[PDB]
Design an enzyme around this catalytic site. Structure first.
Site, PDB file in Angstrom:
ATOM      1  N   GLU A 261      -4.251 -42.986 -42.326  1.00 53.12           N
ATOM      2  CA  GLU A 261      -3.990 -41.846 -42.435  1.00 53.12           C
ATOM      3  C   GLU A 261      -3.314 -42.030 -40.677  1.00 53.12           C
ATOM      4  OE1 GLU A 261      -4.703 -38.057 -43.883  1.00 53.12           O
ATOM      5  OE2 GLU A 261      -6.988 -38.968 -43.420  1.00 53.12           O
ATOM      6  N   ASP A 262      -2.134 -43.349 -41.110  1.00 53.46           N
ATOM      7  CA  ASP A 262      -0.796 -43.640 -39.447  1.00 53.46           C
ATOM      8  C   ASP A 262      -2.068 -43.781 -38.579  1.00 53.46           C
ATOM      9  OD1 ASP A 262       0.987 -42.947 -41.477  1.00 53.46           O
ATOM     10  OD2 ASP A 262       0.699 -40.845 -41.261  1.00 53.46           O
ATOM     11  N   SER A 263      -2.908 -44.098 -38.470  1.00 50.47           N
ATOM     12  CA  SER A 263      -3.774 -44.700 -37.620  1.00 50.47           C
ATOM     13  C   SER A 263      -3.865 -45.795 -36.692  1.00 50.47           C
ATOM     14  CB  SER A 263      -5.378 -44.040 -37.080  1.00 50.47           C
ATOM     15  OG  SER A 263      -5.222 -43.578 -38.024  1.00 50.47           O
TER      16      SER A 263
END
Ligand code: MG
Ligand code: ZN
EC number: 2.7.7.6
Lengths: 141, 147, 54, 56, 83, 56, 54, 171, 56, 56, 56
Positions: free
Chosen positions: B3-5
């Site tokens: 998640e866009d980490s």
């Protein structure tokens, strides 16, 4: 008649209130036994956010101007009503005198501090007995 | 990384990667209402000054300012300013005992900290002595920082 | 009714017509700040002294 | 509008959906009395299949 | 006006709300030094003790279920079938 | 709307959320500063008099 | 944190909305408020009988 | 007047008092609060009749705190003053405005203006006594006072009496 | 309803004055004191009422 | 009872469809304890699928 | 928060740093993504509301 609330510590009672005020927690606490003296502290900065006694005093007034949806007949009737009640107070000379003094000071390019000092001086003199005239020009100069 | 980490190298951070400086400027100014009441930049004494903040006043000088280079933290007063009061105007709590003045200083933010970079004093347009402060703080990239 | 949109009109008509509120509505119990008849609070809990000797 | 439209509606201890004023919206919640957390798609074996399979 | 025991026509099963408020009020009383009716197995948390009393129906309470017409019923938590 | 139906309340924290597969489904990782800022009033009972005494 | 009171504590049930009668307004009020000034002439305390008196 | 009335009171109990003997505790509390105290609606509560047949009704649990609330209906002997009521009493404290008559648990006050003209105040005596043209009103003296007005404040009742009219004064 | 509403009561004759707990004024720096708008409106009602009484 | 039968008619039709003599003796080959266990599980889960009174 | 799933109780796990850590099987009812999204955390102050909050 009294009406003076003085905070004291009933457990310490050894000296007048030498307390500390915790603003982040909203309390006031005795700095000795650590016992709180009051909860739910009020603020003065927060009520000031939405917003002159030195010159205007305690007098209050409100303007009446035209509205978004209104008639021009009602605006004149309300202003003419205030024009009949303008004699109830002799403060018309202070606003006109401060207006003309404002025009002269703005014409002389003097700073606002000299303007406020001159307005304060004219407010100290105003309409006393030893003045006894001078046709409003000499008290302004 | 989901998640866009993003996962960042710690050794690269320690060597100065995406490290930035933040400069916060605190501008204070003394004013005079009707010439009778005059705010003055000075170091407030804990004996005669009422409404004094719980922050420390050891970093202030004799003029009520912090010289640049002094490490400051939150809840620290940068510019000390006091306002004259009248004895028969409020008389709240211990105002009839302090007699002198009331504190009205401008401290640093509660969550902030750093090293005072530059301090300058100048008169503005109407001749009022105001002072501007600039504190620098290096913000090392943390986990919660966005990229 | 006043909580949703037009507060002042509903309140003025209420006071004019001498309206009475039952005060078992959700928003009413919320405004007054006490328990409402929803879920856990839709029933009262009692005690039976005859059950303590069990 | 939906939240403030459907708010004071609940089910009392009689399996009847009615609002706070007592107005009955549904005599039985969902017309069956079943919560939406225990329902699963099922197949009806009465209508499925041909007549020869039904009688078979 | 208190429906008698032979006319109680409500669900005999204890709902999740009734179990929730019974465990909450019972645990609150246990936290306030209430006489415990069950022998403890070494518990310290009050909610675990309340659930221990509910597992053996030793909670001395009775539920006053309000009916929409203004009446009510008295279903003791001991006779209520849990789960 | 700003004083009855809703309001700004205490005992809360707001910050950026991030993932952590090593945690459970229902848990949440709370920072130490938030844990030291917020508090919870517990009742002193003979079961935790020693623990609360240690906390004091 | 407020001070204790000996009055019986009850919940708020029925709420009635009605118009304010002038006689009831005069029976509830305590001051007449005649001076349009805010504070006292000495720029301190309150006007005593004005817009915001004790 | 000494009347008998059936009173009802709501008793609050702590969750630590939920033993099987709790009923006794109720009665205990029902005594400790009711006997001796006073109410502005029923007067000074003297005694409580019928201690064995005390109705307990059903106890209800209020939300927070978990304390128990009870509604008790009992029979009690109470004392309630009334306006314009002839009573008897004995003086306790003396004042220049009048002597304070003691009627049961109530300390009635008699104003000096509500006294006849021949009754004069005497401070030179110990204790100060009201000397008239025939009677001397002292502390231990018995005086028949006609109560003119009574005040019914919550948990506090004071009355005002007079002896100016005929068939009154010292007993 | 006689006990609650009257057409004579619909016409305003006497006006209630709310306390500062409703309109809290501020005294900032002891020389910059701000009053709420309702306070100014009450001042206008007083000036217009006293003016009307003087003219009548 | 009329609302109960009219609210249980479809489910009773499903149970009468899935619980036929040929479907149990031929395909399922259930025994006594297995069939009774299926009945107790169907009645039980039907008693757990009931909506709880008091839900918004 | 337009779902009743958007507000759910959680078990606190004290961890350092400053971001709320959580499992990624709960980001779908919250409709969230780890790109600067802030969340709110409320703490109950009573045992009764904590137990009622944990059982519901
Ligand atoms: Mg986002
Ligand atoms: Zn102290």
């Amino acid at each position: 008649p009294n009406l003076n609330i003085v905070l004291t510590c009933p457990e310490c009672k050894v000296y007048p209130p030498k307390i500390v005020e915790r603003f982040s927690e909203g309390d006031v606490v005795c700095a000795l036994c650590g016992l709180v003296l009051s909860d739910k502290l009020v603020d003065t900065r927060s009520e000031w956010r939405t917003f002159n006694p030195l010159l205007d005093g305690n007098n209050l007034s409100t303007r009446i101007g035209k509205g978004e949806t209104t008639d021009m007949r009602f605006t004149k009737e309300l202003n003419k009503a205030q024009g009949k009640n303008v004699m109830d107070k002799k403060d018309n000379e202070v606003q006109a005198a401060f207006a003309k003094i404002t025009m002269l000071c703005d014409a002389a390019e003097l700073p606002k501090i000299v303007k406020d000092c001159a307005k304060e001086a004219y407010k100290l003199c105003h309409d006393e007995k030893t003045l006894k005239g001078k046709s409003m020009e000499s008290i302004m100069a | 990384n989901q998640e866009d980490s993003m996962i960042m190298n710690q050794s690269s951070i320690d060597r100065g990667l995406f490290r930035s400086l933040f400069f916060r400027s605190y501008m204070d100014q003394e004013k005079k209402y009707g010439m009778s009441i005059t705010e003055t930049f000075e170091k407030p004494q804990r004996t005669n000054t009422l409404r004094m903040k719980h922050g420390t006043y050891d970093k202030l000088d004799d003029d009520g300012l912090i010289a640049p280079g002094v490490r400051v933290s939150g809840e620290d007063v940068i510019i000390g300013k006091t306002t004259p009061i009248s004895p028969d105007e409020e008389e709240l709590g211990q105002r009839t005992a302090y007699h002198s003045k009331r504190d009205a200083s401008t401290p640093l933010r509660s969550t902030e900290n750093g090293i005072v970079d530059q301090v300058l004093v100048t008169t503005n347009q109407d001749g009022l002595k105001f002072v501007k402060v600039r504190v620098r703080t290096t913000k090392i990239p943390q986990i919660g920082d966005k990229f | 009714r006043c909580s949703f949109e037009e507060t002042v009109e509903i309140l003025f008509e209420a006071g004019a017509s001498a309206e009475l509120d039952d005060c078992r509505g959700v928003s009413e119990n919320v405004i007054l700040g006490q328990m409402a008849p929803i879920g856990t609070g839709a029933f009262d809990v009692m005690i039976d002294e005859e059950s303590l000797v069990k | 509008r939906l939240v403030k439209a459907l708010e004071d509606i609940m089910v009392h201890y009689d399996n009847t959906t009615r609002n706070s004023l007592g107005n009955v919206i549904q005599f039985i919640y969902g017309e069956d009395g079943m919560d939406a957390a225990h329902i699963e798609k099922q197949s009806l074996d009465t209508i499925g299949g041909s007549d020869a399979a039904f009688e078979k | 006006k208190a429906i008698p025991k032979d006319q109680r026509a409500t669900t005999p099963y204890m709902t999740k709300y009734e179990r929730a408020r019974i465990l909450g009020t019972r645990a609150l009383q246990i936290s306030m030094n209430a006489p415990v009716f069950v022998d403890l197995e070494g518990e310290t948390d009050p909610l675990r003790i309340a659930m221990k009393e509910l597992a053996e129906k030793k909670i001395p309470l009775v539920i006053r279920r309000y009916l929409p017409d203004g009446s009510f019923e008295d279903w003791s938590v001991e006779e209520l079938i849990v789960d | 709307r700003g004083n009855l139906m809703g309001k700004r309340v205490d005992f809360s924290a707001r910050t950026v959320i991030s993932g952590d597969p090593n945690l459970e489904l229902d848990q949440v990782g709370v920072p130490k500063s938030i844990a030291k800022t917020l508090t919870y009033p517990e009742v002193v009972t003979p079961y935790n008099i020693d623990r609360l005494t240690q906390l004091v | 944190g407020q001070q204790y009171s000996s009055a019986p504590l009850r919940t708020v049930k029925e709420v009635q909305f009605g118009l304010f009668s002038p006689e009831e307004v005069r029976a509830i009020s305590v001051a007449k408020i005649r001076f349009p000034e805010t504070m006292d002439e000495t720029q301190t305390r309150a006007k005593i009988g004005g817009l915001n008196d004790p | 007047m000494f009347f008998i009335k059936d009173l009802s009171l709501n008793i609050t109990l702590h969750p630590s008092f939920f033993g099987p003997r709790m009923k006794q505790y109720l009665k205990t509390k029902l005594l400790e609060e009711v006997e001796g105290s006073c109410t502005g609606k029923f007067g000074y509560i003297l005694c409580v009749l019928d201690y064995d047949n005390i109705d307990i009704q059903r106890g209800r649990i209020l939300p927070t705190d978990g304390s128990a609330e009870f509604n008790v209906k009992y029979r009690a002997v109470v004392f309630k003053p009334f306006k314009g009521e002839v009573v008897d009493g004995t003086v306790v404290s003396c004042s220049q405005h009048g002597f304070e008559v003691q009627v049961g648990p109530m300390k009635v006050f008699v104003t000096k203006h509500l006294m006849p003209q021949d009754l004069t105040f005497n401070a030179g005596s110990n204790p100060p006594s009201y000397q008239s043209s025939e009677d001397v009103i002292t502390i231990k003296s018995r005086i028949r006072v006609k109560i003119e007005g009574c005040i019914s404040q919550v948990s506090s009742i004071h009355a005002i009496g007079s002896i100016k009219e005929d068939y009154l004064g010292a007993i | 309803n006689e006990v609650f509403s009257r057409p004579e009561w619909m016409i305003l004759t006497c006006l209630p004055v709310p306390p500062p707990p409703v309109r809290p004024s501020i005294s900032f720096n002891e020389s910059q004191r701000g009053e709420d708008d309702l306070t100014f409106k009450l001042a206008d009602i007083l000036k217009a009422n006293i003016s009307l009484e003087t003219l009548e | 009872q009329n609302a109960q039968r009219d609210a249980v008619t479809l489910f009773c039709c499903l149970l009468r469809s899935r619980l036929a003599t040929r479907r149990v003796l031929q395909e399922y080959r259930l025994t006594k304890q297995a069939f009774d266990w299926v009945l107790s599980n169907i009645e039980a889960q039907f008693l757990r699928s009931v909506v709880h009174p008091g839900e918004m | 928060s337009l779902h009743k799933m958007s507000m759910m109780a959680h078990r606190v796990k004290v961890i350092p740093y400053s971001t709320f850590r959580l499992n990624l099987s709960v980001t779908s009812p919250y409709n969230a993504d780890f790109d600067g999204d802030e969340m709110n955390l409320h703490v109950p102050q009573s045992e009764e509301t904590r137990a009622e909050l944990s059982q519901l």
